[PDB]
């Protein structure tokens, strides 16, 4: 049928989705920035949508942005959060999956194994959850469906949420993979991807899923695709990953990019093996108690160690690791947001995908090898809005990355030990 005419609205629907400075551009022929909802025709279903949804003029990531992807685009945009990058993207995309029809492929097939029209990307279920949200109100009235899965939930209510039909799917990488390799989706119509939020995906370790789902699958390669990422920060190894899967686009940063962090306060501090629990100890009693707490530790032996030694001393806390049973699995997870144990030591080889959220202090117990894996680790900070705490002890062990680790923190406005510099 067709995809530009609104369906009969639903007064239940609606009381349900709808409850009441710089900018830098960098490229090729970057099509001139927006007014107002107003210039691009969008069509009747996203401004019908824009006043249902409270909306009144797009923001100054979504008025660099909108145009850009609607005139078949990539790009990558550099935005800190509550900058409205989520309608940014789904505004146009589904404009243009409004307009131009499902397809000619599915079209020639119209249950079971699904292939979504567009991919999003999202790091945790609660931004999955928050794209999905949007995506609804923006897709009311239409005949896109879209659907959402993530780790940490059950995976068959999703698997049957998904055989209902899905033109627009978002999701954790780790879950997609399931998805995928169990037969249920399939990439090879996919004509929108966009990755939000891209630097943290990376942080956690999905970049190998990523590199699946994207490169190593039946997914249209660049230049066919549209592509699009998100990201607050832009370190190296995120504009590598927008020079493989980007095509010749067009660079957004509103507020200037910090290359990482910047909600976070970084401590460096000497702390020999010997000390290391009896420091942690005094951590761990100026913590607000309330506040969760995440313990970074090299070795699996490590790990129980240690969470068996602060068990002892009566702290609430939790281990995932890997001589662990893999469904102790989320129950450690899930013990770790409730608060009943705010306290986690863990292995980053097995916090790998793993949505551990909410956590305001990270601790160095043990610092890896390089700097690129110290950045993931202090990544685990959550919110944006509140600042966070990276603690690190430091050694003997750790002189190969002294310099690393000075750069970094001159180059993140943290105080630098005095000692750290005559270590370099
Ligand atoms: N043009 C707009 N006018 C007013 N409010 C808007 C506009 N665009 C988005 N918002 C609201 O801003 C809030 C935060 O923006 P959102 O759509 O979540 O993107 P975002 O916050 O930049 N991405 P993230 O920070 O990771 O959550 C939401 O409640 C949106 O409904």
């Given at each position: 049928?067709?995809?530009?005419?609104?369906?009969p609205?639903?007064?239940?629907?609606?009381?349900?989705?709808?409850?009441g400075?710089?900018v830098?551009?960098?490229?090729?022929?970057?099509?001139?920035?927006?007014?107002?909802?107003?210039?691009?025709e969008?069509?009747?279903?996203?401004?019908?949508?824009?006043?249902?949804?409270?909306?009144?003029?797009?923001?100054?990531?979504?008025?660099?942005?909108?145009?850009?992807?609607?005139?078949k685009?990539?790009?990558?945009?550099?935005?800190?959060?509550?900058?409205?990058?989520?309608?940014?993207?789904?505004?146009?995309?589904?404009?243009?999956?409004?307009?131009?029809?499902?397809?000619?492929?599915?079209?020639?097939?119209?249950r079971?194994?699904?292939?979504?029209?567009?991919?999003?990307?999202?790091?945790?279920?609660?931004?999955?959850?928050?794209?999905?949200?949007?995506?609804?109100?923006?897709?009311?009235?239409?005949?896109?469906?879209?659907?959402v899965?993530?780790?940490?939930?059950?995976?068959?209510?999703?698997?049957?949420?998904?055989?209902?039909?899905?033109?627009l799917?978002?999701?954790?990488?780790?879950?997609?993979?399931?998805?995928?390799?169990?037969?249920?989706?399939g990439?090879?119509?996919?004509?929108?991807?966009?990755?939000?939020?891209?630097?943290?995906?990376?942080?956690?370790?999905?970049?190998?899923?990523?590199?699946?789902?994207?490169?190593?699958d039946?997914?249209?390669?660049?230049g066919?695709?549209?592509?699009?990422?998100?990201?607050?920060?832009?370190?190296?190894?995120?504009?590598?990953?927008?020079?493989?899967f980007?095509?010749?686009?067009?660079?957004?940063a509103?507020?200037?990019?910090?290359?990482?962090?910047?909600?976070?306060?970084?401590?460096?501090?000497?702390?020999?093996?010997?000390?290391?629990?009896?420091?942690?100890?005094?951590?761990?009693?100026?913590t607000?108690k309330?506040?969760?707490?995440?313990?970074?530790?090299?070795?699996?032996?490590?790990?129980?160690?240690?969470?068996?030694?602060?068990?002892?001393?009566?702290?609430?806390?939790?281990?995932?690791?890997?001589?662990?049973?893999?469904?102790?699995?989320?129950?450690?997870?899930?013990?770790?947001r409730?608060?009943?144990?705010?306290?986690?030591?863990?292995?980053?080889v097995?916090?790998?995908?793993?949505?551990?959220?909410?956590?305001?202090?990270?601790?160095?117990?043990?610092?890896?090898?390089?700097?690129?894996?110290?950045?993931?680790?202090?990544?685990?900070?959550?919110?944006?809005?509140?600042?966070?705490?990276?603690?690190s002890?430091?050694?003997?062990?750790?002189?190969?990355?002294?310099?690393?680790?000075?750069?970094?923190?001159?180059?993140?406005?943290?105080?630098?030990?005095?000692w750290?510099?005559?270590?370099?």
């Amino acid at each position: 049928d067709d995809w530009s005419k609104p369906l009969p609205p639903s007064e239940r629907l609606e009381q349900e989705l709808f409850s009441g400075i710089p900018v830098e551009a960098t490229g090729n022929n970057c099509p001139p920035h927006i007014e107002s909802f107003s210039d691009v025709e969008m069509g009747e279903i996203i401004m019908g949508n824009i006043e249902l949804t409270r909306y009144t003029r797009p923001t100054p990531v979504q008025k660099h942005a909108i145009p850009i992807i609607k005139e078949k685009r990539d790009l990558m945009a550099c935005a800190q959060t509550g900058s409205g990058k989520t309608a940014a993207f789904l505004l146009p995309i589904l404009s243009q999956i409004y307009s131009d029809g499902p397809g000619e492929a599915l079209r020639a097939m119209k249950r079971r194994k699904q292939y979504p029209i567009s991919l999003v990307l999202a790091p945790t279920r609660e931004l999955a959850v928050q794209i999905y949200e949007e995506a609804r109100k923006f897709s009311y009235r239409s005949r896109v469906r879209p659907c959402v899965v993530y780790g940490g939930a059950d995976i068959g209510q999703q698997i049957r949420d998904l055989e209902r039909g899905c033109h627009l799917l978002v999701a954790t990488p780790g879950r997609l993979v399931d998805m995928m390799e169990r037969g249920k989706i399939g990439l090879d119509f996919c004509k929108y991807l966009v990755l939000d939020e891209a630097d943290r995906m990376l942080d956690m370790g999905f970049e190998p899923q990523i590199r699946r789902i994207v490169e190593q699958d039946t997914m249209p390669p660049k230049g066919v695709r549209h592509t699009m990422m998100f990201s607050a920060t832009f370190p190296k190894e995120i504009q590598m990953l927008a020079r493989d899967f980007l095509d010749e686009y067009i660079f957004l940063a509103v507020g200037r990019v910090g290359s990482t962090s910047e909600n976070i306060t970084q401590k460096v501090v000497w702390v020999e093996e010997s000390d290391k629990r009896s420091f942690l100890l005094d951590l761990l009693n100026a913590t607000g108690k309330d506040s969760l707490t995440l313990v970074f530790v090299e070795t699996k032996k490590g790990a129980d160690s240690l969470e068996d030694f602060l068990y002892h001393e009566g702290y609430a806390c939790t281990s995932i690791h890997g001589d662990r049973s893999q469904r102790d699995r989320e129950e450690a997870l899930h013990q770790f947001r409730s608060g009943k144990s705010p306290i986690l030591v863990a292995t980053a080889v097995a916090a790998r995908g793993l949505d551990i959220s909410n956590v305001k202090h990270v601790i160095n117990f043990d610092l890896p090898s390089d700097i690129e894996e110290y950045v993931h680790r202090i990544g685990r900070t959550g919110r944006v809005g509140n600042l966070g705490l990276a603690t690190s002890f430091f050694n003997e062990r750790n002189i190969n990355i002294t310099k690393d680790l000075l750069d970094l923190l001159v180059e993140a406005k943290q105080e630098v030990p005095s000692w750290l510099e005559n270590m370099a």
